[PDB]
Enzyme design. Structure first.
Site, PDB file in Angstrom:
ATOM      1  CB  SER A 119      -0.949  -0.001   1.201  1.00  0.00           C
ATOM      2  OG  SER A 119      -1.968   0.967   1.028  1.00  0.00           O
ATOM      3  CG  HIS A 120       0.753   3.780   3.548  1.00  0.00           C
ATOM      4  ND1 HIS A 120      -0.275   3.044   4.097  1.00  0.00           N
ATOM      5  CD2 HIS A 120       1.695   3.887   4.515  1.00  0.00           C
ATOM      6  CE1 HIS A 120       0.021   2.737   5.347  1.00  0.00           C
ATOM      7  NE2 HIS A 120       1.213   3.234   5.625  1.00  0.00           N
ATOM      8  CG  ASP A 290      -3.103   4.011  -1.302  1.00  0.00           C
ATOM      9  OD1 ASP A 290      -3.821   3.897  -2.336  1.00  0.00           O
ATOM     10  OD2 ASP A 290      -3.211   3.245  -0.320  1.00  0.00           O
ATOM     11  CG  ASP A 292      -3.090  -0.571  -2.259  1.00  0.00           C
ATOM     12  OD1 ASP A 292      -3.750  -1.499  -1.735  1.00  0.00           O
ATOM     13  OD2 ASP A 292      -2.965   0.564  -1.744  1.00  0.00           O
ATOM     14  CG  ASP A 294      -6.664   0.905  -0.502  1.00  0.00           C
ATOM     15  OD1 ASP A 294      -5.592   1.542  -0.539  1.00  0.00           O
ATOM     16  OD2 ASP A 294      -6.967   0.110   0.425  1.00  0.00           O
ATOM     17  NE  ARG A 295      -4.038   5.444   2.870  1.00  0.00           N
ATOM     18  CZ  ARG A 295      -3.412   5.470   4.044  1.00  0.00           C
ATOM     19  NH1 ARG A 295      -3.971   4.921   5.120  1.00  0.00           N
ATOM     20  NH2 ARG A 295      -2.218   6.037   4.146  1.00  0.00           N
ATOM     21  CE  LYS A 391      -9.862   2.194   2.734  1.00  0.00           C
ATOM     22  NZ  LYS A 391      -9.497   0.829   3.240  1.00  0.00           N
TER      23      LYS A 391
HETATM   24 MG    MG Z   1      -3.738   1.291   0.072  1.00  0.00          MG
END
Ligand code: MG
Length: 564
Positions: A119-120, A290, A292, A294-295, A391
């Site tokens: 992710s982040h 981010d 991947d 989802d943010r 998300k």
């Molecule tokens: Mg993420």
């Protein structure tokens, strides 16, 4: 060669491959320097699948592009093939955003997916790597399944693998592998990374309206920063190629194995380049994702910051600008408990259920699967809908663009109108990082005891000029209406009669200590107050929070590490 032998490899188990809610995350060097570390974990995931169901099963596989991802995908193919998994569906070059994985699982009715993302967190030869498992509803594997994977990983003594199997990740189509002394082949389908996800968005949104918004001389001017992560090609193919935004709209939209040497984490400082671009006043709308996808962070003209708690409330308040919700209707709203109460004002006014959940996907997924949840938000730059079971940052951007098209106002004017209609929830999160865990726990326990005393409700706190009165004070608990689970000790809540709150959470202890998260949600309805500076309007409740908790006295911190 596409004819390959199956081999059993003796291995030594590791003791720390506990997958958590977002996957197993370790330093890249750990994966590289620990023999069979990745292989053990992949085998442990696959061993949760009933042997009888493997041949008819498909796993969706892809990741965010970070260093080591393609080597990990090759390992997954070699081990899935040897274990009798019938098919893998893999994004081209190994690239799939986390929302695209969720999309594809549900579309093709796969048994699940393995997502290569942290992710982040930073990527590269000295960065982090993550392996995430999603199940057949397209969402994160729940605790019962991650528990089983962990259990298997700690006693694994062997795994099955086809050492000579090699997938060409760069070319679209079906690659078939014949396994020595196995009747049925192993099949890999390489799919375009964007197509299925774009086809989903094309049904959710009015792409004709958005093309008109984004093209021409009178266009809405946007700058969309993928932060060198997975969403880059999605931006280029959807917003630029299909919807006609000029190519310069797509910022940092080539995936890089090290995310350009930075954290692909969308906030005002990690995405400072986008903020500075927006400050020039040339663009109407900006957004950052981010690693991947989802943010999302949302910006207006001049770098006006839409805080994520307000963002979900604005989308809720204009939700029927989006064709998907015109057809489904609005089944419910939800936010994590620390997220600001802005969404609640909209839900109350429009008489829609508001679910206030602990932090965690499972709570949203349960409600969506009950057809009780259309739109959800988290203060940590998270926005989603029941279109999938993760998300979805680019989804949130197209929601905002749909709203801009129908409202024909600037981002900032929409927020000002929103605050005038619903009042404003000024909001900030204070993170105190790497605090000594023993003093931090003492802070929490002492504050909880204070709050539990019979006399605490009704206590008054002054600024002065203003009096806050405690309406309710507890340690948040949630009884899940779908799976019956009871989540306890989810956060200390000070709830005030005027609609404001203070929330304290204490993270688990890492290698350098724990994080105290302090959330301040100050509600104002007065026209003379809703357009003031947020850190000024939050200062009285911040003072009350630090005084009642004795945070400085317990931790030695005079200031948070990060303010959001
Ligand atoms: Mg993420």
């Amino acid at each position: 060669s596409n004819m390959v032998k199956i081999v059993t490899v003796k291995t030594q188990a590791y003791q720390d491959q506990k997958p958590g809610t977002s996957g197993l995350r370790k330093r890249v060097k750990v994966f590289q320097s620990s023999a069979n570390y990745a292989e053990n974990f992949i085998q442990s995931i696959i061993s949760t699948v009933e042997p009888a169901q493997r041949q008819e099963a498909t796993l969706v596989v892809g990741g965010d592009g970070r260093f080591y991802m393609k080597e990990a995908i090759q390992l997954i193919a070699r081990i899935a093939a040897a274990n009798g998994i019938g098919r893998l569906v893999i994004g081209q070059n190994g690239i799939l955003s986390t929302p695209a994985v969720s999309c594809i699982i549900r579309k093709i009715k796969a048994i699940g997916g393995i997502i290569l993302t942290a992710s982040h967190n930073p990527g590269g030869p000295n960065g982090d790597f993550g392996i995430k498992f999603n199940i057949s509803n397209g969402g994160p594997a729940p605790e019962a399944i991650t528990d089983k994977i962990f259990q298997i990983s700690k006693t694994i003594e062997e795994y099955a693998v086809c050492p000579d199997l090699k997938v060409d990740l760069g070319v679209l189509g079906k690659q078939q592998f014949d396994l020595e002394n196995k009747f049925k082949p192993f099949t890999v389908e390489i799919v375009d990374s964007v197509e299925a996800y774009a086809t989903m968005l094309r049904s959710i949104f009015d792409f004709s309206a958005l093309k008109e918004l984004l093209s021409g001389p009178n266009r809405l001017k946007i700058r969309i920063d993928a932060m060198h992560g997975v969403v880059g090609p999605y931006v280029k193919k959807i917003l630029c190629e299909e919807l006609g935004a000029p190519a310069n709209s797509a910022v940092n939209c080539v995936p890089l194995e090290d995310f350009g040497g930075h954290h692909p984490d969308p906030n005002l400082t990690y995405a400072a380049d986008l903020v500075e671009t927006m400050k020039s006043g040339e663009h109407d709308f900006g957004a950052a994702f981010d690693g991947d996808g989802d943010r999302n962070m949302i910006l207006g003209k001049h770098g006006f910051f839409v805080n994520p708690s307000d963002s979900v409330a604005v989308i809720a308040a204009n939700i029927f600008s989006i064709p998907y919700f015109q057809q489904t209707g609005v089944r419910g709203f939800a936010r994590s408990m620390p997220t600001s109460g802005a969404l609640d004002r909209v839900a109350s006014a429009t008489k829609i259920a508001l679910y206030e959940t602990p932090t965690g996907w499972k709570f949203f997924g349960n409600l969506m699967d009950a057809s009780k949840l259309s739109l959800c938000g988290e203060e940590s730059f998270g926005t989603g809908s029941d279109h999938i079971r993760e998300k979805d940052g680019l989804w949130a951007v197209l929601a905002w663009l749909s709203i801009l098209a129908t409202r024909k106002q600037s981002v900032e004017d929409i927020l000002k109108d929103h605050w005038q209609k619903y009042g404003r929830n000024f909001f900030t999160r204070y993170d105190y990082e790497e605090v000594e865990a023993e003093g931090a726990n003492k802070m929490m326990k002492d504050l909880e005891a204070l709050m539990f005393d019979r006399s605490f409700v009704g206590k008054q706190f002054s600024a002065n000029d203003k009096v806050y009165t405690v309406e309710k004070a507890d340690n948040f608990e949630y009884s899940d209406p779908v799976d019956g689970s009871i989540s306890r000790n989810q956060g200390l809540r000070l709830i005030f009669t005027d609609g404001s709150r203070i929330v304290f959470q204490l993270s688990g202890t890492g290698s350098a200590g724990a994080t105290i998260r302090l959330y301040i949600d100050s509600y104002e309805k007065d026209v003379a107050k809703i357009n003031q500076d947020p850190q000024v309007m939050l200062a009285p409740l911040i003072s009350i929070a630090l005084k009642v908790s004795q945070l400085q006295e317990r931790t030695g911190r005079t200031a948070p590490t990060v303010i959001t």
